Design a protein around this ligand. Structure first.
Ligand SMILES: Cc1cc(/C=C/C#N)cc(C)c1Oc1nc(NC2CCN(Cc3ccc(S(N)(=O)=O)cc3)CC2)nc2ccsc12
Ligand SMILES: [Mg+2]
Lengths: 556, 412
């Protein structure tokens, strides 16, 4: 006998105030009982479970199921109830590596650790909660009662505890072999290196030697998978990676369920297939929870799909990460709030791609969206590579400087250079800081009846120009913007405008270049046509000349 | 200090479960070296999967120091940790600190690592050093001693500190010493030469009781509510008078008796914005009476220790930032302005981050607590970058302003 080290037990508790489960065992057929007795007698011989007496008051139901060519009954202990009552754990698996962050490895071995799993002992004070009962034949004797000594499959804590236990066992080996990498997935253990196949096979035997200290046997995985590894939706090749085949189906009828799956594939594909777009296809889902509702595709959703099929016509691949090269991120504006990007180290060899869609909002502009795209890519790059990339952005250096020096919010984007790839992000208008000499001064105002929705919008100027327009189905806020719109329409290329609308000032000072309000959009179009616009605000109802005059003109 | 002080969370509250945000490789590496040493010294221990809690961690460099430093973001744990009266019913904040000519800030957080943390509470200090690209599980630790940045540390350590200081305080009855979290604020009314002597004569005294060698020098001399000021001009355009009536109308929410009728009278008609308007005698007097009103303090301003302090900040351009601290709107307890922020003439976010830290320091000195900030920045920009410029051992709360406030003009 070669002494082995025990695997350190993780102490486990039930959630505070909760007891263990007490679920009644279902009736089983004689055939199933026979099967379960055989299965459990074997698990009992292997130390996985132990017989207990009738003093233990807990119980979890057990079942017997089968496969159809597989000629056997399977055992199933339903731990749903016990899982509801078990403490939470540090779930150390949620996130997985992104392939574009991995570094090339010349050699990779796989080891099956499905049997090392059962060497992980369950905390002794917790085993009682795992009791289950095999009903007896004809219910004429006491049921056979067992509890687990090992981490049960299906129990809430088994994945976290198993992975934590292996990690702790592996830590000294990884620390003293910095020329290999070790990664675990389910019952599989992957070991890669850049050593010659000779020294590499030797590290594997050393790792096998190491694991034996805990009595863990580990042969190679059955039917060694030739590359690529099919893993988490990817294809990991020795020198490249991509997603698994992206195949868009052909249909003349598309339901709410169809369009959801189409976006899923497209979103998955967008991490390597550049220029994927999903707005028009997403717009056909704005608000529904029933899934066969055949929604016809707009001529713009069809175009978007067909554009995606073109992008998906041929397979594309990303490269793996080279720490000795720079990391470069490039962004293009696609239209309608959509943005695409590529991250690379060598021109034409993307590590990965991606996209960004404008946030929901009443007003927005391209520079704010570009800024947001930059922060998203920054955060993604820190996750994947531990560093911010250099950005190549379709915005002139002078445009950015004008924007952030004058914008009312603090804003920042990290090291970047201009790339002349149309369409370019630009400022579409800039208001004056001072009133314009020689420019006509329009005092604007609007008002609406709360009940009738009737209103008026208008202006008076220092040259005696005047206008009041009657409006129906309007509101105070809308007449206030309508008054500014009329002043823009009716003035020359330079204009001073005086408003008392804090609402309108709040919109325009946010510097939108597009709106969900058609009226704001019309104002933006006017501002773009001007040479100079100074917008001044005054408080309402204070006897400010010009403002006082027009206020009475539009207030009935 | 073998005996641990029993600590508990508030009733019906579990421990913190805060996601660790991603870290650059250089910060991960710095944290690995720091935590390896802390673990060898027994200050922290590796934890297991039966501990589901988490508090974020990052790495900073204190003001003008090249050595990386670990900063734990205990904000969630602090609000979940029981309200504390460790020794007495409370520490009456020293109103004299803000009056002192000079105030030096000493990082004494190292002293905390000499006191053990109650064993039942340790699990709630769990934190994770993350891996890059999830290529390995994060390194999981918990504290075995009082951690820096935790609410309970100054509270649990206060009995020990008051004794370490009593000899020094006994000889210098006129020196005010205040502690906030990991920081000691040492103030006096004397010329710096003696002050830095006393300061150096305080840390030495501290070194013999068991440090850092760093200091932060302040002058709460100049801390009040900045007056509202009105232009003094010989010729007023229509535009000037419009801006004046707007500012006075805003000020009338703060001050009673502000009038704009005679000034508005000047704008009788529909005049060009650039036209010069002569002031009438009535308008000049009204303006003069408004100036007088604005010289006196605001009516009924008082600090209520049961309410949050609120700090608003405006970007004024060219490196200038204005700010107000209040509890109720229009009842400013402090206003100020900053210019030429150090080391960031080309980075807005760094400037805002330093302004947030200076305002927080002023707030600690005046009231002994931190304000809730209203930040003129989009959330995603702020949350991507602020940790890159943070140099303080505390962290305040903040919210984001997405609509441009009209009042930025009035603090111009
Ligand atoms: C080692 C490893 C394997 C997998 C597979 C899962 C499945 N199913 C997943 C991860 C996250 C792994 O973890 C790391 N993987 C890498 N790099 C990889 C190594 C594998 N190659 C593909 C490949 C290479 C050589 C052969 S070969 N010539 O042997 O046939 C076959 C396939 C891509 C890069 N780097 C690190 C660093 C820290 S962890 C870790
Ligand atoms: Mg009006």
């Amino acid at each position: 006998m070669v002494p082995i080290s025990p695997i350190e037990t993780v102490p486990v508790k039930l959630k505070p105030g909760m007891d263990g489960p007490k679920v009644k065992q279902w009736p089983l057929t004689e055939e199933k009982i026979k099967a379960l007795v055989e299965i459990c007698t074997e698990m009992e011989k292997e130390g996985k479970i132990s017989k207990i007496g009738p003093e233990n008051p807990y119980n979890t139901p057990v079942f017997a199921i089968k496969k159809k060519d597989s000629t056997k009954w399977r055992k199933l202990v339903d731990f749903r109830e016990l899982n509801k009552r078990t403490q939470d754990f540090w779930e150390v698996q949620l996130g997985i590596p992104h392939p574009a962050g991995l570094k090339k490895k010349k050699s990779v071995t796989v080891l099956d650790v499905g049997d090392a799993y059962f060497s992980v002992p369950l905390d002794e004070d917790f085993r009682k909660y795992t009791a289950f009962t095999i009903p007896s034949i004809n219910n004429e004797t006491p049921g056979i009662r067992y509890q687990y000594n090992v981490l049960p499959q299906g129990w809430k804590g088994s994945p976290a505890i198993f992975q934590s236990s292996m990690t702790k066992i592996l830590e000294p080996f990884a620390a003293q072999n910095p020329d290999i990498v070790i990664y675990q997935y389910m019952d599989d253990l992957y070991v890669g290196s850049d050593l010659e196949i000779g020294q590499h096979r030797t590290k594997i035997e050393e790792l096998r030697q190491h694991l034996l200290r805990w009595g863990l046997t580990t042969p190679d995985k059955k039917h060694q998978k030739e590359p690529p590894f099919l893993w988490m939706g990817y294809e990991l090749h020795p020198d490249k990676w991509t997603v698994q085949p992206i195949v868009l189906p052909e249909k003349d009828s598309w339901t709410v369920n169809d369009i959801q799956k189409l976006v899923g594939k497209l979103n998955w594909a967008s991490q390597i297939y550049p220029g994927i777009k999903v707005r028009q296809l997403s717009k056909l889902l704005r608000g529904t929870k029933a899934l066969t509702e055949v929604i016809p595709l707009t001529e713009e959703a069809e175009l978007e799909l067909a554009e995606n099929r073109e992008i998906l016509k041929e397979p594309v691949h990303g490269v793996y990460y080279d720490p000795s090269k720079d990391l470069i991120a490039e962004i293009q504006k696609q239209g309608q709030g959509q943005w695409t990007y590529q991250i690379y180290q060598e021109p034409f060899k993307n590590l990965k791609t991606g996209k960004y869609a404008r946030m929901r909002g009443a007003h927005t502009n391209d520079v704010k969206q570009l800024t947001e795209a930059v922060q998203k890519i920054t955060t993604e790059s820190i996750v994947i590579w531990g560093k911010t990339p250099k950005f190549k952005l379709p915005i002139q250096k002078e445009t950015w400087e004008t924007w952030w020096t004058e914008y009312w919010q603090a804003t920042w984007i990290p090291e970047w250079e201009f790339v002349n790839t149309p369409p370019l992000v630009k400022l579409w208008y800039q208001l004056e800081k001072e009133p314009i000499v020689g420019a006509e001064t329009f005092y604007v105002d609007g008002a609406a009846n709360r009940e009738t929705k009737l209103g008026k919008a208008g202006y008076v100027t220092n040259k005696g120009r005047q206008k009041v327009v009657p409006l129906t189905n309007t509101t105070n806020q809308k007449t206030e913007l309508q008054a500014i719109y009329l002043a823009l329409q009716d003035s020359g290329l330079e204009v001073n405008i005086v408003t008392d609308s804090q609402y309108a000032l709040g919109i325009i000072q946010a510097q939108p270049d597009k709106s969900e309000s058609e009226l704001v959009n019309q104002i933006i179009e006017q501002l773009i046509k001007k040479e100079k616009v100074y917008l001044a605000w005054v408080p309402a109802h204070k006897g400010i000349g010009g403002n006082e005059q027009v206020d009475k003109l539009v207030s009935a | 200090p073998i005996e641990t002080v029993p600590v508990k969370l508030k009733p019906g509250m579990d421990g913190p479960k805060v996601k660790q945000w991603p870290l650059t490789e250089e910060k991960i590496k710095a944290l690995v070296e720091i935590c390896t040493e802390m673990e060898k010294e027994g200050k922290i221990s590796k934890i297991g999967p039966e501990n589901p809690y988490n508090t974020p961690v990052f790495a900073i460099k204190k003001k003008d120091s090249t050595k990386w430093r670990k900063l734990v973001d205990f904000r969630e744990l602090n609000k979940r940790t029981q309200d504390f009266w460790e020794v007495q019913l409370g520490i009456p904040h020293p109103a004299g600190l803000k009056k002192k000519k000079s105030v030096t800030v000493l990082d004494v957080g190292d002293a905390y690592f000499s006191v053990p943390l109650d064993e039942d509470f340790r699990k709630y200090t769990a934190f994770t050093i993350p891996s890059i690209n999830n290529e390995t599980p994060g390194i999981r630790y918990q504290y075995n001693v009082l951690p820096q940045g935790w609410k309970g540390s100054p509270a649990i350590f206060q009995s020990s500190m008051t004794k370490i200081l009593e000899p020094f305080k006994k000889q210098n009855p006129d020196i005010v010493i205040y502690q906030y979290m990991d920081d000691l604020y040492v103030g006096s009314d004397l010329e710096i030469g003696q002050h830095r002597t006393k300061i150096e004569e305080l840390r030495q005294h501290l070194l013999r009781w068991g440090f850092l060698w760093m200091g932060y020098e302040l002058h709460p001399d100049k801390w009040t509510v900045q007056p509202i000021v009105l232009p003094e001009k010989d010729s007023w355009t229509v535009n000037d008078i419009q801006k004046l009536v707007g500012k006075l109308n805003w000020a009338s929410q703060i001050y009673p008796g502000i009038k704009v009728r005679q000034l508005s009278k000047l704008l009788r008609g529909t005049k060009a914005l650039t036209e010069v308007i002569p002031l009438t005698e009535e308008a000049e007097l009204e303006l003069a009476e408004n100036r007088e009103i604005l010289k006196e303090p605001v009516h009924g301003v008082y600090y209520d220790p049961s309410k949050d302090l609120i700090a608003e900040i405006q970007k004024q351009g060219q490196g200038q930032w204005t700010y107000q601290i209040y509890q109720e709107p229009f009842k400013n307890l402090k206003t100020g302005k900053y210019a030429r922020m150090r080391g960031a003439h080309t980075n807005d976010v760094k400037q805002l981050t330093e302004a947030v830290q200076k305002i927080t320091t002023e707030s600690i000195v005046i009231w002994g607590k931190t304000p809730k900030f209203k930040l003129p920045i989009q959330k995603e920009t702020w949350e991507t970058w602020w940790t890159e410029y943070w140099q303080a051992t505390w962290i305040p709360e903040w919210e984001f302003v997405n609509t441009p406030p009209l009042v930025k003009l009035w603090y111009q």
